[PDB]
Design an enzyme around this catalytic site. Structure first.
Site, PDB file in Angstrom:
ATOM      1  N   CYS A 210      -0.109  -4.127  -5.607  1.00 11.74           N
ATOM      2  CA  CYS A 210      -1.265  -3.349  -5.488  1.00 11.74           C
ATOM      3  C   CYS A 210      -1.484  -2.733  -6.714  1.00 11.74           C
ATOM      4  CB  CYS A 210      -1.476  -2.501  -4.282  1.00 11.74           C
ATOM      5  SG  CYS A 210      -0.103  -1.204  -4.208  1.00 11.74           S
TER       6      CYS A 210
ATOM      7  N   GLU B 140      -4.653   1.622   2.792  1.00  9.63           N
ATOM      8  CA  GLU B 140      -4.153   1.270   1.535  1.00  9.63           C
ATOM      9  C   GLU B 140      -4.217  -0.180   0.980  1.00  9.63           C
ATOM     10  OE1 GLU B 140      -2.784   3.487  -0.730  1.00  9.63           O
ATOM     11  OE2 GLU B 140      -2.306   5.385   0.521  1.00  9.63           O
TER      12      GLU B 140
HETATM   13  C1  LIG Z   1       0.445  -1.473  -2.269  1.00  7.61           C
HETATM   14  C2  LIG Z   1       0.809  -2.887  -1.976  1.00  7.61           C
HETATM   15  C3  LIG Z   1       0.386  -3.583  -1.431  1.00  7.61           C
HETATM   16  N1  LIG Z   1      -1.177  -3.394  -1.125  1.00  7.61           N
HETATM   17  C4  LIG Z   1      -1.992  -4.585  -0.730  1.00  7.61           C
HETATM   18  O1  LIG Z   1      -1.873  -5.579   0.133  1.00  7.61           O
HETATM   19  C5  LIG Z   1      -2.267  -6.600   0.286  1.00  7.61           C
HETATM   20  C6  LIG Z   1      -0.974  -7.838   0.601  1.00  7.61           C
HETATM   21  O2  LIG Z   1      -1.637  -9.125   0.746  1.00  7.61           O
HETATM   22  P1  LIG Z   1      -1.239  -9.883   1.853  1.00  7.61           P
HETATM   23  O3  LIG Z   1       0.207  -9.769   2.396  1.00  7.61           O
HETATM   24  O4  LIG Z   1      -1.574 -11.199   1.855  1.00  7.61           O
HETATM   25  O5  LIG Z   1      -2.000  -8.817   3.188  1.00  7.61           O
HETATM   26  P2  LIG Z   1      -2.345  -9.350   4.753  1.00  7.61           P
HETATM   27  O6  LIG Z   1      -3.597  -8.350   4.818  1.00  7.61           O
HETATM   28  O7  LIG Z   1      -2.531 -10.781   5.022  1.00  7.61           O
HETATM   29  O8  LIG Z   1      -1.279  -8.826   5.421  1.00  7.61           O
HETATM   30  C7  LIG Z   1      -0.859  -7.273   5.720  1.00  7.61           C
HETATM   31  C8  LIG Z   1      -0.544  -7.012   7.227  1.00  7.61           C
HETATM   32  O9  LIG Z   1      -1.634  -6.926   7.916  1.00  7.61           O
HETATM   33  C9  LIG Z   1      -1.408  -7.886   9.036  1.00  7.61           C
HETATM   34  N2  LIG Z   1      -2.785  -8.446   9.292  1.00  7.61           N
HETATM   35  C10 LIG Z   1      -3.442  -9.396   8.800  1.00  7.61           C
HETATM   36  N3  LIG Z   1      -4.882  -9.620   9.222  1.00  7.61           N
HETATM   37  C11 LIG Z   1      -4.747  -8.818  10.327  1.00  7.61           C
HETATM   38  C12 LIG Z   1      -5.801  -8.538  11.459  1.00  7.61           C
HETATM   39  N4  LIG Z   1      -6.915  -9.144  11.280  1.00  7.61           N
HETATM   40  N5  LIG Z   1      -5.568  -7.525  12.126  1.00  7.61           N
HETATM   41  C13 LIG Z   1      -4.191  -6.797  12.034  1.00  7.61           C
HETATM   42  N6  LIG Z   1      -3.462  -7.068  11.282  1.00  7.61           N
HETATM   43  C14 LIG Z   1      -3.455  -7.902  10.166  1.00  7.61           C
HETATM   44  C15 LIG Z   1      -0.499  -8.993   8.533  1.00  7.61           C
HETATM   45  O10 LIG Z   1       0.154  -9.470   9.923  1.00  7.61           O
HETATM   46  P3  LIG Z   1       0.672 -11.094   9.744  1.00  7.61           P
HETATM   47  O11 LIG Z   1      -0.665 -12.012   9.421  1.00  7.61           O
HETATM   48  O12 LIG Z   1       1.777 -11.045   8.532  1.00  7.61           O
HETATM   49  O13 LIG Z   1       1.107 -11.221  11.069  1.00  7.61           O
HETATM   50  C16 LIG Z   1       0.673  -7.838   7.888  1.00  7.61           C
HETATM   51  O14 LIG Z   1       1.261  -7.118   8.749  1.00  7.61           O
HETATM   52  C17 LIG Z   1      -2.585  -6.827  -1.226  1.00  7.61           C
HETATM   53  O15 LIG Z   1      -3.956  -6.625  -1.497  1.00  7.61           O
HETATM   54  C18 LIG Z   1      -1.975  -5.700  -1.993  1.00  7.61           C
HETATM   55  O16 LIG Z   1      -2.520  -5.279  -3.168  1.00  7.61           O
HETATM   56  C19 LIG Z   1      -1.816  -2.170  -1.008  1.00  7.61           C
HETATM   57  C20 LIG Z   1      -0.996  -1.135  -1.436  1.00  7.61           C
HETATM   58  C21 LIG Z   1      -1.382   0.380  -1.673  1.00  7.61           C
HETATM   59  N7  LIG Z   1      -2.657   0.523  -1.707  1.00  7.61           N
HETATM   60  O17 LIG Z   1      -0.368   1.187  -1.395  1.00  7.61           O
END
Ligand SMILES: *[C@@H]1C=CN([C@@H]2O[C@H](COP(=O)(O)OP(=O)(O)OC[C@H]3O[C@@H](n4cnc5c(N)ncnc54)[C@H](OP(=O)(O)O)[C@@H]3O)[C@@H](O)[C@H]2O)C=C1C(N)=O
Ligand SMILES: *[C@@H]1C=CN([C@@H]2O[C@H](COP(=O)(O)OP(=O)(O)OC[C@H]3O[C@@H](n4cnc5c(N)ncnc54)[C@H](OP(=O)(O)O)[C@@H]3O)[C@@H](O)[C@H]2O)C=C1C(N)=O
Lengths: 452, 452
Positions: free
Chosen positions: B260, B226
């Site tokens: 999102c 998502e």
């Molecule tokens: C409806 C609501 C939201 N969305 C879409 O989500 C993103 C939100 O942006 P952001 O907070 O900047 O996302 P992020 O991807 O940086 O972090 C999200 C989670 O993923 C973890 N994470 C980041 N990078 C990785 C990797 N490489 N591997 C595993 N996990 C990762 C983050 O961890 P931390 O960095 O915080 O430790 C975090 O847990 C927007 O684009 C928004 O639109 C989607 C929705 C929907 N479709 O339902």
């Protein structure tokens, strides 16, 4: 990419692989075709699909000869495969529109529902073992749903791959709706990474699936993986023993053993094991090995020299470790990639073979003392595709159904695929489901609609 | 991993990340818990789920305060988020058993059907923007289905993540059925590669999804993604203009723009564009910016300094390219990560911003001349999550429903998620569906059963 007849070992025809520029041109044409094809009515798609079924139904023997020539399955079983290919075409012709109808859910909206729309270009990567059926299994619902498809078939069945495209052309499907790509495994990455390709499905081995799924994952594209199995065939004391032996023999040895849902591990309750094993031994020994074009033949050659080398090694190493050969266990000294029906017993704990797929007519046999032991042994593999259990005790039947870790559990019959029922794996056998409703729901946009 | 209050910039509490050995121990416990949990009745699961709902319903304000403190959304909207979290718990309590009931299909079998069984441990990776709702969105159906779950939440919402686990413990869910992992992004690979982990779901940005899905693909494990969107909000001449302005303002600016399914690109028919844009300008101009704990606040701070830096740069570069600022367009001169409601117009063709997600209360506005142009522009993005269109012409409504390339199309309303209807993206917004029937069918073994 070549036709090499596994009965003789002879190279019959070679084919030039597409270049990246040629692959690109095919994807451009698929995209253009999709823009029009997504607007076709179900009536048109149904007509073309039913035409394809009729072509398969008329020229069954001819298509079967292509399969047999290229990959060595018996001509009679290849006829059955062409027939089953027609059946899945008819299944989606008959049910596809209903299966994709709007589903309304009551809310405060004047109208709220889910509708189902095609994604676009679907890549399919397919194996040589059921070179028509596996293609029609994905293609029938894809085309009924309004997707277009590009097929990367196995490199040893180019004539089958071309024949499927020719069938769909003759049926009336517009140019670009289905295209066979004569390309090797190294060329698939370009397809997955192309922005016009929206999804990918693979039937094949784990390394192939891992490659395709990891690449698709990077590109944010959905996948479906149908991989191998080491399905248990469990026989308990209340079973019809003679039926179980007959059916078990078919389940292990059909398609020269090269089936994902072959019975690979026979798990026999100690009360019936001696009788079952002796009968199994006799049945296997009576199988006719030879020219797969002959209607009397049970066992043709394995499809490739590589498969022959692999099973020969797997068996040799198991025997060196202490496994016993009850029957077979060595390649035949004749032209073609022949390996005999084989039965292995007393396999030592921790032998690597216990965790591997035997893609050849080689049965592993085990004895167990009770239901818990049967279930534990049945599940003690990385795979989880199908499972068959033989018992007429209702409580045992229910425990087998509930507790066997597989995508399909058959009681008192061999595992088979059937367009009416979904089909797929769990664990390292894959994920997602083909056939039934599932087959036509996998690669569509389920679009939620809300109208005030 | 820390609570840093985005209203003040103050670091409030830090947390030690788990070590790999500690992660391993949690996975071992989850596996043991699953072995028992898969045997629980729906009545038990339903009781615990309904207990969780009641906890959320009772202490909504307290949970909301945690959300606001950690990530800056208004306390009032966080109360609504806690309420919606309760709602999805109740939805799966009320429907989950029925949704997972055997589905019988007539064949020559005495019995042939599909049953639905849990896979095992599900990994969920979740974002800070809806730190309760997105967790309960996946957790409610997971737990009703008999899966167990490990949660890797965003590193800036550790108190929210711990609170969700505490709610589920207090509700009665056995130890190991749900576990919050206080771990960073680099630690997720260990979880995906662990043989006990059977599936993974991620809500987040594309790079996060690509990482998780590529890794899961290599391990032959199913996923659901998502991801983000740049949803169009299309307004045509027969629309209720005042309603469209009011609703559009909420759609862009709710959750401080960080949704999102925010309305991100306003696509206005030229016949109404002047009136609509003036009214949108006026509505944005009078939104109340301030402390999100105050009930009168419309716009709190963005959640992190990184988001603030990113939107500031995106806007600055668009303006440098020639885009015009109608309102806002620079960070506020105050403590906390505040960025004002902003409207950009006359964005030059080929500006990078046209293809990016604006995760902040910044509206891009466009004018179009007809229906074909509106649809083309609406779809001219890599994303495809939601879409909203405003018109009272039935023919236009149907074309928008059919032709907008999104997972959800709302006519004369803003896109919203609702437990009763499936929710997910297409294109680079992801694949798979949460909510409705889909949410509880995604991560189960659909086991085909055939009984002679
Ligand atoms: C409806 C609501 C939201 N969305 C879409 O989500 C993103 C939100 O942006 P952001 O907070 O900047 O996302 P992020 O991807 O940086 O972090 C999200 C989670 O993923 C973890 N994470 C980041 N990078 C990785 C990797 N490489 N591997 C595993 N996990 C990762 C983050 O961890 P931390 O960095 O915080 O430790 C975090 O847990 C927007 O684009 C928004 O639109 C989607 C929705 C929907 N479709 O339902
Ligand atoms: C029911 C029936 C079969 N199966 C399972 O499939 C395999 C068959 O084994 P094998 O033929 O040896 O498979 P393969 O994986 O080598 O080849 C299959 C197709 O994949 C292509 N391919 C191989 N490697 C790659 C990579 N890295 N990337 C993309 N594509 C790849 C092959 O191409 P060529 O090498 O021929 O060019 C070929 O097209 C058994 O395990 C069997 O059980 C699954 C069934 C089911 N679940 O429905």
């Amino acid at each position: 990419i070549a036709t090499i007849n596994p009965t003789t070992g002879e190279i019959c025809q070679r084919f030039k692989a597409l270049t990246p520029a040629e692959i690109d041109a095919k994807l451009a044409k698929a995209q253009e075709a999709f823009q029009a094809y997504r607007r076709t009515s179900f009536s048109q798609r149904r007509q073309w699909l039913e035409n394809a079924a009729a072509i398969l139904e008329r020229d069954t023997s001819k298509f079967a000869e292509i399969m047999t020539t290229e990959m060595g399955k018996t001509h009679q079983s290849a006829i059955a495969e062409a027939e089953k290919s027609a059946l899945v075409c008819r299944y989606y012709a008959e049910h596809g529109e209903q299966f994709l109808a709007n589903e309304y859910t009551e809310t405060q909206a004047t109208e709220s529902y889910v509708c189902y729309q095609p994604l676009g270009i679907l890549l399919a990567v397919m194996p040589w073992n059921f070179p028509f059926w596996q293609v029609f299994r994905f293609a029938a619902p894809a085309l009924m749903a309004g997707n277009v498809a590009v097929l990367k078939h196995a490199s040893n069945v180019p004539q089958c791959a071309l024949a499927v495209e020719a069938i769909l052309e003759a049926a009336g499907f517009p140019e670009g709706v289905f295209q066979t790509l004569l390309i090797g495994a190294s060329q698939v990455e370009q397809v997955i990474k192309d922005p016009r390709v929206k999804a990918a499905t693979l039937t094949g081995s784990e390394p192939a699936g891992a490659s395709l799924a990891s690449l698709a994952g990077q590109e944010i594209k959905p996948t479906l993986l149908e991989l191998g199995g080491s399905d248990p065939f469990v026989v308990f004391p209340s079973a019809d023993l003679d039926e179980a032996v007959e059916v078990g023999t078919v389940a292990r040895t059909m398609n020269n053993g090269q089936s994902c849902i072959a019975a690979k591990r026979f798990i026999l309750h100690e009360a019936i094991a001696a009788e079952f094993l002796e009968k199994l031994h006799l049945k296997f020994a009576s199988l006719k090995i030879g020219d797969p074009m002959a209607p009397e033949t049970d066992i043709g050659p394995l499809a490739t020299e590589g498969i022959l080398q692999d099973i020969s090694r797997q068996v040799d190493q198991a025997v060196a470790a202490g496994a016993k050969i009850l029957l077979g266990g060595r390649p035949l000294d004749r032209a073609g990639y022949f390996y005999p029906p084989t039965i292995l017993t007393e396999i030592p704990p921790g032998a690597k073979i216990l965790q591997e797929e035997l893609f050849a007519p080689v049965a592993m046999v085990f004895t167990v003392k009770d239901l818990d032991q049967a279930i534990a042994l049945a599940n003690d593999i990385p795979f989880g595709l199908g499972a068959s259990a033989w018992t007429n005790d209702p409580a045992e039947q229910q425990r087998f159904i509930q507790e066997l870790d597989a995508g399909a559990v058959f009681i008192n019959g061999m595992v088979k695929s059937d367009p009416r029922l979904p089909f797929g794996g769990t664990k390292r056998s894959g994920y997602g489901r083909e056939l039934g409703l599932a087959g036509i729901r996998t690669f569509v946009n389920a679009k939620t609609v809300w109208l005030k």
